[PDB]
Design a protein around this nucleic acid. Structure first.
Ligand SMILES: [Mg+2]
Ligand SMILES: [Mg+2]
Ligand SMILES: [Mg+2]
Ligand SMILES: [Mg+2]
Ligand SMILES: [Mg+2]
Ligand SMILES: [Mg+2]
Ligand SMILES: [Mg+2]
Ligand SMILES: [Mg+2]
Ligand SMILES: [Mg+2]
Ligand SMILES: [Mg+2]
Ligand SMILES: [Mg+2]
Ligand SMILES: [Mg+2]
Ligand SMILES: [Mg+2]
Ligand SMILES: [Mg+2]
Ligand SMILES: [Mg+2]
Ligand SMILES: [Mg+2]
Ligand SMILES: [Mg+2]
Ligand SMILES: [Mg+2]
Ligand SMILES: [Mg+2]
Ligand SMILES: [Mg+2]
Ligand SMILES: [Mg+2]
Ligand SMILES: [Mg+2]
Lengths: 234, 180, 51, 148, 134, 65
RNA sequence: GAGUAGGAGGGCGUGAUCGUUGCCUAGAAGUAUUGGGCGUGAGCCUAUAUGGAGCAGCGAUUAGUGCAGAUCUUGGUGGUAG
RNA sequence: CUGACCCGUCUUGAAACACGGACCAAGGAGUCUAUCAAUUAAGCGAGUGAUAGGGUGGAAAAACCCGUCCGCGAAACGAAAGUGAGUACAAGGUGCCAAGCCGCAAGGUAGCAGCAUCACCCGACCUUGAGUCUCCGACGAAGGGUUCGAGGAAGAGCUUAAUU
């Protein structure tokens, strides 16, 4: 008698929570989709803003005979050029900190005496560079994956960005891309959120892996040039 | 090829021993607390599960004197649960009123706790009483054994107070000046 | 507490080729799409002049 | 038994887990049979896990007779545990005469105080007593009696 | 019980036959031939046995709990009903005794298959008596 | 006979294999290397200090003095 | 997702014993297979032929329990060679 | 078409111009007894367990009951003479820290087991002592150690099987 009844009650309670949640969520999601759109638009506007800013500063400069040096890249990308075997243990660990644990692993890192110094040791095993926001986006759309309670999860919905980073104020892929490119208040978690990028074979051959990009080789910072490489791998 | 430790297959030692006992009843009690553990967010039950999956030797004795000694004003009204066997301490003179829950009561511990106006409880009962573990007191007995003295540091390294394995204790046994 | 069913995923799709994905991530896309068309449809007369 | 043993799982592995280099050989590998070379190449063993093995201690007993050395000990705490509950309660209420506990009949000879005693009075008949045993017995309202 | 008995007999049941690590049961009341708490009729409550007789009659055997009573209704194992409506009757009986969806499906299976079976059996017994005579 | 006399080759790696173990920082440390003067002082100043909870019979001894 | 020395976890196959379920003069064991299949693999099931009296599964108990080697034991055979 | 040295072995190094192996069947190599330990499952728990032996019992060497002692634990430290877990109302303090209870949360309360440390205690070795008596050797109020111990401080054992 009583057991069955209490269950039926369970059921009603359930349909209830289901309706409440359905409408609440729906409302929330309207709000959301709107947010997303407003944000994306505004963001892109800000990019074009800065880029143009650079253009004109350059112009005033050129006219003066003076020159204008844009602020230096605060975000870099590194990809692992070399195999695992036969490496100094230090080097190994430096790689591990940069979270490139295998070949053709891209990742983002800040630009620091800290980070930059920690790359001295791996220079010959990796290429790093200064990516365009475009590149960054492309990476996150094609190669986007997320670290979810340890799982490696394809970036598809935004529900995920909200799940783990929501409270930081990251609701959307575009937001992600923004803290990345700006390197805002929470870079760190924005990053760790992003699974180390498993890339592809470059369509262009690498040039020479024994040689520094400077000698026509690949190892080092190709400052701006990293983008080309990414393009070849994507 | 990736350079991950143990190849990401690292074994988790953080977990609850899968018990091999054969009393059908332990397995069952365990079914119960697996339920309570996954479906109840109460630490107390999870705890009970970890400790009931214990190595036969890893279950440690609760004595009436042990319980008595650990009692607060609130500890008295509260259900006392040990994850182990509860036994009588023959040198406890007066025995308080207790409602105790263990796996096993030495019949002496039982007689004295009951004849003192007490109640003996088994975990199926405990479940029914307070699944959250509300107003429950979980007793973890002290850990002693002879093995422990042979362990630690080796027997005759500088500052070793550990005990040697000896077949007899006599003036003639490892009690004589070593070769120094 | 009541039983939840397990986590869900969607196999990664490539936004760059597949639109609906782009839009689910960034609806602004659709807008920037249409604009791109309408802004491009800017007449040939206008182009000539602007040059 | 047999089907549990390593052999079964070792069949066909050729070294029987005794190694290809060092295989399973006779006493030479044991380091000599038994307690052999304890003092030499086995020094470290002996010293480390059986320190004080080699040597001599104080006084030879030519014929040692244990029977007369036989002296089971009791502690104060277990006293009342020897005699029934009937007794200690009935003389908690009744102060007319006081309880006599014979350690002897229990197979013990010396009484050492270990724990402490109820405030209820006792007489204890034992072969020997420790300064503290007597202390606590007397202080409780109790008395010590010497037996043979 | 069904729990304790599971743990007790899961491995050593006398109704047990194994095939490639798939354990099946000989239990007359098994709702699925396979050896599982649910498959095992002599364990839990729901189990059914069905025998043919007197041209349509299905003998339905309702696994019944262990009983100390004033009179003895049938075998301690179960209850025994003669049903003349058979298929339809038994289908109802099942519907009553098996509330959950699956058990229903299974029992019913046991039915359809059972019946058509008993039909073929009939044909054969016929041909057999007409073989003994002619 | 001929042998390789001392090589430290594999030993460093071997040592880093499981990590370099470091001891536990324990609030309270052993008394080795500390002089008896200071030690007696500690003993006394603890015995007499009421703000430091002793055992029962201990406090009896301390309160009698 | 490498692996010798080595270690751990699961599994295959063989006697005999206590159980449990059975198969066989309407043909057991054993044996041969360019018959048909099942296991990643130890191994398995079937078919046909031969054979002419015993067998088999499942749960446990136990072990003189698995061989390519040891100038290994005993027996039987080659090429050299009419 | 592409790939393909002879296996087993010892060796830093084997297809080796290293050794054994022409072929096949059957046989063929970590056992058995004892010993301690660690772990796993069992029983009982300040106890545990018999052995020998008694007494019954199936056709039967089983089984089933009894089994005043004994083993091992329950007290330790000493070469030993010897002493013994010293205020009867004790069974501590501190740092890490789990449950339960509060609290949306932040955190708060509490403090089981373990680890580290300080304290107390018994005994070895030192040191000190009013007074007491069966006063020549013992007793003991008070007061201590730079030290020693396979120890106390609300007992964790004992029997069975298995593996290494
Ligand atoms: Mg090239
Ligand atoms: Mg190189
Ligand atoms: Mg791989
Ligand atoms: Mg001694
Ligand atoms: Mg093994
Ligand atoms: Mg091996
Ligand atoms: Mg190390
Ligand atoms: Mg044999
Ligand atoms: Mg014939
Ligand atoms: Mg088989
Ligand atoms: Mg024939
Ligand atoms: Mg078997
Ligand atoms: Mg053979
Ligand atoms: Mg052979
Ligand atoms: Mg010849
Ligand atoms: Mg070829
Ligand atoms: Mg060959
Ligand atoms: Mg050569
Ligand atoms: Mg040789
Ligand atoms: Mg006997
Ligand atoms: Mg003893
Ligand atoms: Mg403490």
């Amino acid at each position: 008698p009583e057991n069955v009844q209490k269950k039926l009650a369970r059921d009603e309670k359930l349909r209830k929570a289901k309706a409440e949640q359905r409408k609440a969520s729906s409302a929330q999601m309207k709000q959301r989709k709107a947010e997303w759109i407003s944000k994306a638009q505004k963001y892109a506007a800000e990019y074009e803003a800065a880029e143009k800013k650079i253009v004109d500063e350059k112009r005033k400069a050129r006219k003066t005979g003076a020159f204008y040096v844009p602020a230096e890249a605060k975000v870099a990308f590194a990809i692992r050029i070399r195999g695992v075997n036969q490496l100094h243990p230090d080097v190994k660990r430096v790689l591990r900190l940069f979270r490139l644990r295998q070949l053709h692993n891209g990742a983002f890192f800040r630009v620091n005496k800290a980070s930059l110094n920690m790359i001295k040791r791996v220079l010959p095993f990796i290429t790093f560079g200064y990516p365009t926001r475009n590149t960054i986006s492309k990476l996150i759309y094609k190669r986007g994956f997320a670290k979810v309670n340890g799982q490696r999860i394809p970036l598809t919905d935004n529900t995920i960005v909200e799940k783990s980073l929501g409270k930081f104020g990251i609701t959307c892929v575009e937001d992600l891309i923004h803290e990345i490119t700006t390197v805002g208040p929470h870079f760190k978690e924005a990053n760790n959120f992003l699974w180390p990028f498993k890339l592809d074979t470059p369509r262009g051959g690498f040039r020479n892996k024994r040689h520094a990009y400077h000698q026509g080789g690949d190892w080092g910072n190709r400052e701006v040039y990293i983008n080309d490489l990414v393009k070849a791998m994507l | 090829a990736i350079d991950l430790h143990k190849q990401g297959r690292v074994v988790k030692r953080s977990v609850v021993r899968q018990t091999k006992s054969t009393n059908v009843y332990h397995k069952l009690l365990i079914k119960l607390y697996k339920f309570l553990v996954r479906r109840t967010d109460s630490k107390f039950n999870q705890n009970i599960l970890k400790r009931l999956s214990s190595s036969r030797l890893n279950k440690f004795p609760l004595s009436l004197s042990r319980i008595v000694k650990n009692l607060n004003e609130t500890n008295k009204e509260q259900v006392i649960v040990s994850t182990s066997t509860v036994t009588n301490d023959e040198r406890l003179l007066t025995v308080p009123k207790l409602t105790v829950c263990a796996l096993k009561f030495t019949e002496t511990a039982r007689k004295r706790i009951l004849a003192a106006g007490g109640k003996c409880l088994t975990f199926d009962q405990l479940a029914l009483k307070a699944p959250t573990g509300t107003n429950c007191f979980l007793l973890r007995a002290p850990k002693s054994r002879e093995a422990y003295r042979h362990w630690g540091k080796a027997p005759g390294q500088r500052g070793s107070h550990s005990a040697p394995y000896v077949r007899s204790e006599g003036r003639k046994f490892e009690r004589a000046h070593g070769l120094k | 507490k009541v039983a939840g069913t397990t986590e869900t995923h969607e196999r990664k799709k490539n936004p760059l080729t597949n639109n609906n994905a782009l839009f689910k991530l960034n609806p602004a896309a659709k807008i920037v799409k249409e604009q791109a068309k309408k802004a491009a449809e800017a007449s040939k007369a206008k182009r000539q002049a602007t040059l | 038994v047999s089907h549990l043993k390593k052999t079964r799982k070792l069949r066909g592995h050729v070294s029987h887990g005794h190694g290809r280099v060092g295989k399973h050989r006779k006493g030479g590998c044991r380091g000599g049979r038994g307690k052999a070379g304890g003092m030499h190449h086995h020094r470290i063993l002996m010293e480390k896990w059986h320190p004080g093995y080699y040597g001599k201690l104080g006084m030879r007993t030519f014929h040692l007779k244990k029977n007369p050395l036989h002296c089971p000990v009791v502690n104060i705490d277990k006293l009342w545990s020897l005699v029934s509950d009937a007794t200690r309660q009935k003389y908690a209420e009744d102060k007319k005469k006081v309880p006599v506990i014979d350690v002897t009949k229990a197979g013990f000879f010396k009484v050492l105080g270990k724990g402490r005693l109820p405030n209820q009075p006792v007489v204890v008949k034992a072969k020997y007593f420790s300064k503290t045993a007597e202390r606590r017995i007397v202080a409780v309202g109790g008395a010590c009696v010497l037996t043979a | 019980m069904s729990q304790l008995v599971w743990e007790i007999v899961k491995n050593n049941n006398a109704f047990l036959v194994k095939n490639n690590g798939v354990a099946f049961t000989t239990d007359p009341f098994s709702v699925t031939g396979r050896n599982t708490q649910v498959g095992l009729g002599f364990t839990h409550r729901h189990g059914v046995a069905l025998k043919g007789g007197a041209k349509q009659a299905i003998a339905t055997s309702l696994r019944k709990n262990q009983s100390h009573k004033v009179k003895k209704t049938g075998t301690i194992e179960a209850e025994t009903l003669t049903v003349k409506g058979g298929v339809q009757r038994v289908a109802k009986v099942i519907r009553g005794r098996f509330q959950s969806k699956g058990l229903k499906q299974f029992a019913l299976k046991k039915l359809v298959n059972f019946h058509r079976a008993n039909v073929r059996a009939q044909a054969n017994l016929k041909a057999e008596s007409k073989a003994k005579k002619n | 006979a001929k042998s390789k006399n001392s090589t430290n080759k594999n030993q460093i790696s071997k040592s880093h294999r499981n990590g370099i173990k470091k001891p536990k920082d324990h609030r309270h440390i052993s008394t080795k290397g500390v002089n008896p003067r200071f030690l007696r002082n500690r003993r006394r100043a603890i015995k007499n200090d009421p703000s430091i909870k002793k055992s029962k019979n201990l406090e009896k001894k301390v309160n009698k003095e």
